[PDB]
Amino acid sequence: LVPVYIYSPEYVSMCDSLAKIPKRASMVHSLIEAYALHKQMRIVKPKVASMEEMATFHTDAYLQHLQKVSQDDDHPDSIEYGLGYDCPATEGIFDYAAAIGGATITAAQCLIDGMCKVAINWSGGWHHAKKDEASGFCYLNDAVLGILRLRRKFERILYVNLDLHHGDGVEDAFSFTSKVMTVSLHKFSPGFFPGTGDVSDVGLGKGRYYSVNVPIQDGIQDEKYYQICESVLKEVYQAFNPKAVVLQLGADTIAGDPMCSFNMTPVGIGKCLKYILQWQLATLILGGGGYNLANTARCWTYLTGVILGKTLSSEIPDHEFFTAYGPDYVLEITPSCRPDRNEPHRIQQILNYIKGNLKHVVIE
Numbered sequence: 001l002v003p004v005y006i007y008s009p010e011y012v013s014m015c016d017s018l019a020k021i022p023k024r025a026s027m028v029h030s031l032i033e034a035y036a037l038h039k040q041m042r043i044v045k046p047k048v049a050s051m052e053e054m055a056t057f058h059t060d061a062y063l064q065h066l067q068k069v070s071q072d073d074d075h076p077d078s079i080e081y082g083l084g085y086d087c088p089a090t091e092g093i094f095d096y097a098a099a100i101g102g103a104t105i106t107a108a109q110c111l112i113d114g115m116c117k118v119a120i121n122w123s124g125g126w127h128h129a130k131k132d133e134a135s136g137f138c139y140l141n142d143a144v145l146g147i148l149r150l151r152r153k154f155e156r157i158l159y160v161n162l163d164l165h166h167g168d169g170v171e172d173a174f175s176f177t178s179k180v181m182t183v184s185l186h187k188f189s190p191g192f193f194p195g196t197g198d199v200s201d202v203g204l205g206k207g208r209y210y211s212v213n214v215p216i217q218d219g220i221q222d223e224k225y226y227q228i229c230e231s232v233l234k235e236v237y238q239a240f241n242p243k244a245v246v247l248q249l250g251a252d253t254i255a256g257d258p259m260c261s262f263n264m265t266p267v268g269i270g271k272c273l274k275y276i277l278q279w280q281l282a283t284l285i286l287g288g289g290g291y292n293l294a295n296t297a298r299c300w301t302y303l304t305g306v307i308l309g310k311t312l313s314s315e316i317p318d319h320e321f322f323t324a325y326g327p328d329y330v331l332e333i334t335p336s337c338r339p340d341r342n343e344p345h346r347i348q349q350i351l352n353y354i355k356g357n358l359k360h361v362v363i364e
């Protein structure tokens with residue numbers, strides 16, 4: 001059955017007002033629309049998240065504060081709740097947060113109701129927010145909210161974070177439970193945000209070994225990334241037997257991102273995505289980071305094509321943002337001539353560590 005595409009003109013307009021990524025949502029949607037991919041999808045208007053739905057993870061104190069300042073960047077309680085340079089108390093930020101949370105919840109509900117096997121919210125994936133604090137441009141953790149909605153039907157949910165940054169907010173939220181396993185492939189290097197997610201972080205208490213982290217260094221390309229991803233997910237699948245998947249596909253790993261860390265292309269990420277889709281589980285697709293706006297659109301458009309199993313023309317079709325795609329005006333991204341800093345011995349060590357940990361899961 002046909003993938004659900006979480007979309008409304010209002011939703012994109014709201015997502016467009018996010019101060020760190022202005023107009024990104026429109027560029028992503030308009031490229032998908034320019035490739036006519038939306039015609040092959042079921043378009044679903046997202047619901048706005050209610051106070052009660054948001055409070056299934058976030059505290060009432062934090063949410064009431066967010067609501068207050070959304071109507072104010074100099075409040076004395078904002079520092080406590082993580083509001084600052086990374087998460088400015090922009091006017092309307094509570095509405096933008098409620099829209100993105102509601103969108104991912106709507107995606108989850110569609111999956112629960114058997115409307116689709118795959119549901120897409122490219123504007124979601126704000127995985128750093130904590131129950132009571134904003135963090136890393138994230139004011140509300142829609143990925144956690146999405147997982148909590150899926151928990152209505154699924155007893156084993158797998159969260160997979162393929163983003164440059166560790167999905168710390170999500171991992172933390174489920175650190176003590178075994179119903180949700182988190183798997184994160186991300187850059188791990190002292191001083192690099194958020195600073196967590198070493199391979200030794202495996203969760204706590206009853207959630208011990210139900211958090212998986214794959215610390216990766218600068219320069220990694222498609223082939224090695226896919227090998228790492230396939231070997232981990234093969235072990236996770238056999239060990240954990242997930243019944244639903246929440247997959248975050250950040251674009252901030254792609255060559256050309258100004259963070260200039262990993263050296264991936266959308267084709268490489270696509271392979272990881274294909275590996276997960278062939279499990280044929282209810283899958284909630286989210287975006288994430290992506291700071292080269294045109295490349296982020298290239299990436300999520302291509303990946304939408306993968307979900308649909310469609311091969312797209314390399315030539316960017318004319319559309320509202322055509323000029324943003326110069327000077328080559330093509331869909332494909334070329335890797336930078338930068339060294340891969342990932343030692344094959346270190347990769348193997350990490351993978352063996354992880355296999356060791358998942359052995360404990362299997363024997364349980």
Ligand SMILES: CN(C)c1ccc(C(=O)NCCCCCCC(=O)NO)cc1
Nearest residue numbers: 086136137163165193250252288289290
């Ligand atoms: C050029 N400029 C003004 C900035 C550049 C980088 C950051 C930053 O990395 N901040 C730390 C927070 C990064 C959050 C990343 C969100 C994400 O992609 N998560 O996956 C801030 C400002």
Ligand SMILES: [K+]
Nearest residue numbers: 174180207210
């Ligand atoms: K867990």
Ligand SMILES: [Zn+2]
Nearest residue numbers: 163164165289
């Ligand atoms: Zn990121």
